[PDB]
Amino acid sequence: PIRKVLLLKEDHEGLGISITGGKEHGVPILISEIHPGQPADRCGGLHVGDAILAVNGVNLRDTKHKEAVTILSQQRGEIEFEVVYVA
Numbered sequence: 001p002i003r004k005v006l007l008l009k010e011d012h013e014g015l016g017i018s019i020t021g022g023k024e025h026g027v028p029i030l031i032s033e034i035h036p037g038q039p040a041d042r043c044g045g046l047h048v049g050d051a052i053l054a055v056n057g058v059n060l061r062d063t064k065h066k067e068a069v070t071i072l073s074q075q076r077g078e079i080e081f082e083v084v085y086v087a
Contacts, residue, residue, distance in 0.1 A: 015040070017033065
């Protein structure tokens with residue numbers, strides 16, 4: 001089940017969540033670590049075990065982990081995040 005959650009990021013604030021994996025290896029990037037006291041916690045949606053699919057309309061499945069880091073950083077102010085609950 002795909003979940004659409006909109007998170008507001010600021011220039012002074014960071015991502016608030018850590019990702020792991022590697023598309024180049026043959027697997028999509030997912031959320032594993034969460035920083036307590038950041039936009040991620042404020043959203044109440046960024047949970048451990050989230051599979052990334054698209055960010056701000058940009059496809060991540062066809063991009064590499066390193067490339068995704070740069071693209072994610074390009075998102076300013078309002079950032080749209082699309083992930084799927086994995087268990």
